[PDB]
Each structure stands twice: as C-alpha cells, then as structure tokens.
Amino acid sequence: VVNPNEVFCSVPGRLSLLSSTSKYKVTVAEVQRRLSPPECLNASLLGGVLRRAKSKNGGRSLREKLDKIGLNLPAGRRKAANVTLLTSLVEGEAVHLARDFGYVCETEFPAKAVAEFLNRQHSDPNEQVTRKNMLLATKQICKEFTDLLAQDRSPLGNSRPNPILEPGIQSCLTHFNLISHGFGSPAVCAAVTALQNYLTEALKAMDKM
Amino acid sequence: VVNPNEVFCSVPGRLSLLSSTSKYKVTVAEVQRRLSPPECLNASLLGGVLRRAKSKNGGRSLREKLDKIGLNLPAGRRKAANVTLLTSLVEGEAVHLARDFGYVCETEFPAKAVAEFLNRQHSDPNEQVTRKNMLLATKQICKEFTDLLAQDRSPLGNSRPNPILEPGIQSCLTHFNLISHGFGSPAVCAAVTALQNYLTEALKAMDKMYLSN
DNA sequence: CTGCCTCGGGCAC
DNA sequence: GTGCCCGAGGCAG
Ligand SMILES: NC(=[NH2+])NCCCO
Ligand SMILES: NC(=[NH2+])NCCCO
Structure with a gap:
C-alpha cells in the first residue's frame, strides 16, 4: 500500500x-x-x-x-505539443499493458513456425555455419540491449530508486519513460522476447540437422 | 466508406x-x-x-x-479467462496503438545515447571488428524477421487480402493477429525499429569515433 | 474547444 | 451472471 x-x-x-x-x-x-x-x-x-x-x-x-x-x-x-494514445495511460496500467504484451509475445507469438519458415529460406548447405553465427550474434546483441533497458531506474508510481546507470544515459531513458508513462522500455523488451524465441527456435531447428 | x-x-x-x-x-x-x-x-x-x-x-x-x-x-x-488488456481493443484502436508505439520508438527512443553507452561497454580495440560484424548481422537478421511480419495478410477491419505467404506460416501469423486484435505483429515491428535505430547509431558512432573525439 | 446530459460500466448483490 | 444509477465522456454546438 x-x-x-x-x-x-x-x-x-x-x-x-x-x-x-x-x-x-x-x-x-x-x-x-x-x-x-x-x-x-x-x-x-x-x-x-x-x-x-x-x-x-x-x-x-x-x-x-x-x-x-x-x-x-x-x-x-x-x-x-505531442499526445499519443500512450498519453491517456496511468503509469500502473502502462506497466501492466507492457507486461501483458510480454505475456502474449512469450505465449502466443509463433516463434517455432517463424524459425522453420525463415531457416527454409536458407537451405544452401554452405551457408548454415554463417546463418548460425548471424543468429547467435543477434541473440547476444539483443540481450545486451534489453539488459540496458532493464537497468532503467526512472521514477514510476511512488518509487524513486537510486539509479544504477550514470546520469547521462539515465536522463535519456527517463525521457522515453515520461512520454510513454512507463510503457516504452518494457514494451520494447516484451517485443524482443518474440525475436529471442524465434532465434532460439531457429538455432534448435538447425541443430536437429 | x-x-x-x-x-x-x-x-x-x-x-x-x-x-x-x-x-x-x-x-x-x-x-x-x-x-x-x-x-x-x-x-x-x-x-x-x-x-x-x-x-x-x-x-x-x-x-x-x-x-x-x-x-x-x-x-x-x-x-x-485468458483475456488480456489487448482483448479490450477494437481492431482499429489496436492498430492505432501499434502505430503510435512505432511513432514513439522512431521519434522519442534515445537510440544515439543507447548506442554510445553500449559501444562504451565494448570499447576495447581488440573487439571492435567483432562488435561491428555482430551489429551488422543483428541488422540483417532483424530486417529479415520484420520483413516476414510485414507480409502478414491476416484479415483486419473490412480487409480480406489475398495471402502472399504459404498457408502454414500465414495461419500462425493470423493466430497472433486474432489474440492481439491486430496489435501484435505491428507492435513487434515498432519495437524492432527502436533496436534497428540503436544498431544504426552504434555502427555510425564507431565509424565517426575519430571526429567524435 | 466547452460542458450538458446520454448511456457506459464499477459495483453490489 | 445481472443490471442500477453514479458520473465519465461523447457529442452537440
Ligand atoms: N514485461 C516485459 N517487458 N516482458 C518481457 C518478458 C516476457 O515474458
Ligand atoms: N478461450 C476460450 N476458448 N474460452 C471460451 C470458452 C467458451 O467456449
């Protein structure tokens, strides 16, 4: 409370x-x-x-x-000067909506069917090592990107945690927090969950051959 | 009309x-x-x-x-009992919300500051060639991924377009359209534009590292 | 754009 | 699961 x-x-x-x-x-x-x-x-x-x-x-x-x-x-x-549909949201419902988007990306996005379909567009036996490295590289870059967004300590609700990031990058993440009422960074993370599940399923399907 | x-x-x-x-x-x-x-x-x-x-x-x-x-x-x-906040939306507002998310990812996400911070975490001379190649591979895999989502021809509004994808993958994309009321695939593309902008700005800040110092 | 008065939806049952 | 009646906001202007 x-x-x-x-x-x-x-x-x-x-x-x-x-x-x-x-x-x-x-x-x-x-x-x-x-x-x-x-x-x-x-x-x-x-x-x-x-x-x-x-x-x-x-x-x-x-x-x-x-x-x-x-x-x-x-x-x-x-x-x-700049009003979007996100401007209507109270911060609690903005965060809740981003968690809901993360939930549907994790449980309803067809990561395995997308992996099978895109792997099938690269069926040259001589490009499989290249594709595998491109997929691993994508998983690591996207993880570093979402690890940064998860270190955001922008005030929301009655919370004002001590920042863990330096003030420069934290002021820029706080700007994206303020225009989005807290939706922005967690929704970007939610979507990258669909991408990471695709990349996992693509590596898993390649490794079966 | x-x-x-x-x-x-x-x-x-x-x-x-x-x-x-x-x-x-x-x-x-x-x-x-x-x-x-x-x-x-x-x-x-x-x-x-x-x-x-x-x-x-x-x-x-x-x-x-x-x-x-x-x-x-x-x-x-x-x-x-598996209703989410997305279940409340009419399709026209679901797409409009995805368009606005795309607009704030394009215009308000601090892609340059994020690029500068993450380049600085991996700024050793001995990793700059590998980082460049990983950033470029990320851009290509992400573009191929959003290109597939852009080929979705799920019915929305009064639209029933002819599918351009095989029925199997189109079926799976339509499933994600139906549970999200049209928000899902466009919102995923919206977020991936913030990531793509970060990758562009990271590659450009490496390219211009000399003039930046 | 202001704000009245219809009718949406939080709430009690 | 129903549906009243307070008060949000659609719409008239
Ligand atoms: N809440 C979120 N930002 N979602 C990311 C992880 C999905 O289970
Ligand atoms: N998601 C569902 N299938 N639930 C609805 C149950 C009524 O058939």
Whole structure:
C-alpha cells in the first residue's frame, strides 16, 4: 500500500473487461511527472488521464485540488505539443499493458513456425555455419540491449530508486519513460522476447540437422 | 466508406484524450473474429469490447443483433479467462496503438545515447571488428524477421487480402493477429525499429569515433 | 474547444 | 451472471 497522503486519486483502468482490475492509484509524484517537462499536460488533458467528468469549471476544481497538495497548474497552460494514445495511460496500467504484451509475445507469438519458415529460406548447405553465427550474434546483441533497458531506474508510481546507470544515459531513458508513462522500455523488451524465441527456435531447428 | 451493411457498430476509442479520434467502425468480420476460435468471446466480453451499457437484457439484445447478421452466439458460452488488456481493443484502436508505439520508438527512443553507452561497454580495440560484424548481422537478421511480419495478410477491419505467404506460416501469423486484435505483429515491428535505430547509431558512432573525439 | 446530459460500466448483490 | 444509477465522456454546438 502507498501512503494515502501520497495518493492523488484512484482511476479505473481503460483496457479492463468486466471489472478485471481494481482501480489504479495515481500518486502526487505521477501527477507531478505529467505536469512537468517534457509533456507539461494542462488541466483538461490531466483531467482525461485521471478519467474525471468534464464539468463546468472542472479545470478550476482540478487546479485547486493540485494547489492543495503543492503542485501549481496555471489556468492559461496550453495543450501539450505531442499526445499519443500512450498519453491517456496511468503509469500502473502502462506497466501492466507492457507486461501483458510480454505475456502474449512469450505465449502466443509463433516463434517455432517463424524459425522453420525463415531457416527454409536458407537451405544452401554452405551457408548454415554463417546463418548460425548471424543468429547467435543477434541473440547476444539483443540481450545486451534489453539488459540496458532493464537497468532503467526512472521514477514510476511512488518509487524513486537510486539509479544504477550514470546520469547521462539515465536522463535519456527517463525521457522515453515520461512520454510513454512507463510503457516504452518494457514494451520494447516484451517485443524482443518474440525475436529471442524465434532465434532460439531457429538455432534448435538447425541443430536437429 | 465501408458498406454500412458490413458495419456492426462504431466504438469510441478507450485510449483517446479529449475526443482526439472518430469512433472506430467494428465490421461484422471483426465481430466474427472475436466469436470464433481462438478467443470464442461470449456476449458479456463482446459487450465490453463494443463498450455497450450493461442494461436489463443486454446479453439477449446483443445475441438477437448477432442472429440478425447470421452469427449464432449461444447464451451459455463459457467466459474466456485468458483475456488480456489487448482483448479490450477494437481492431482499429489496436492498430492505432501499434502505430503510435512505432511513432514513439522512431521519434522519442534515445537510440544515439543507447548506442554510445553500449559501444562504451565494448570499447576495447581488440573487439571492435567483432562488435561491428555482430551489429551488422543483428541488422540483417532483424530486417529479415520484420520483413516476414510485414507480409502478414491476416484479415483486419473490412480487409480480406489475398495471402502472399504459404498457408502454414500465414495461419500462425493470423493466430497472433486474432489474440492481439491486430496489435501484435505491428507492435513487434515498432519495437524492432527502436533496436534497428540503436544498431544504426552504434555502427555510425564507431565509424565517426575519430571526429567524435 | 466547452460542458450538458446520454448511456457506459464499477459495483453490489 | 445481472443490471442500477453514479458520473465519465461523447457529442452537440
Ligand atoms: N514485461 C516485459 N517487458 N516482458 C518481457 C518478458 C516476457 O515474458
Ligand atoms: N478461450 C476460450 N476458448 N474460452 C471460451 C470458452 C467458451 O467456449
């Protein structure tokens, strides 16, 4: 449980069917990320992220709620320059969606059929050692890439872990965290799971011959 | 315009802020995909996908609407327990979410900073020829992998294109289309553009190492 | 874009 | 599994 003093509000997930998920907690720290660069969301956009009724002067109620817990959101703030579907997500549901994508990549992506099909496009007996080395090289480069993304210690929810990466690379990974509400790096890792399962199945199928 | 006779209903996007998207059209074809293997959604889950009010006899009216277009959904069909957050999506929003993921992987993923960091972890002179060849092999294998996914001709929306792949592999790709509502293969291609950009920037930072120092 | 008032869906049963 | 009624947000304007 997050300290209730740190909870700005609770928000029902956007992507749940038949009340599959409990509401997500949205912390002061999360709201502060949405209000700060690079997004600088305004009252109207943040009201949408928080799934709040569009009421007369709802802008004004949200801005007074923020003022009480120490965040200043001016009435005159323009709409953000770059909005995607990821901008709607609360950080809990963004992380949950990336884990779901990782789950479907691991359990539904046809890695073995893809391996058999692509191995079949290279049936010259004199290119098998080359293809095998290209596949091993791909598995190792992709592992180093996803090991770096897994060392991301960008703040999410009420967490602010000590960084393990140097500040330069951590500020760049934090930028990708902020525009994606935490979806980006874990979703990239989720997809590379489909690629790594293909590469595993391709090596396994070659090694049978 | 999609023939209105082929449109089951229109569904407001779940991930749109401040009315940024038109309602998505849901074709009869899309509904038939959700009701058929592998998902076999029941009336209650399909009602959530279509974002319909849980009204008195909502199940019955949905099943009557489905019989009028020739789709038989038995009232006793078991409730699928392997639903994910992707199961909530209409196909138009699933593809739009994959397109936006592709857009942030192309424009906001810090491929150059990641290239510089990972080149620095493997910066010994004695490994720079092997690293270059591993980076180049990674680019070629990844491009071949995304080229196969780009040849998927799974039905989506009102589209039923002629397959360009053999039926076996097309069948397997369609399975991943159906469980992800069209998100899966495009989202995997989106992420692999972030990896491809890292590989390009890693090769260019090695090429320009002298001028960089 | 604002915000009313329809109707989606969290919730209790 | 059903479906009320609060309140999110679709849509009118
Ligand atoms: N959650 C994730 N980023 N997924 C990667 C691993 C899939 O089991
Ligand atoms: N995924 C499923 N097959 N579940 C649905 C059960 C109803 O036949």
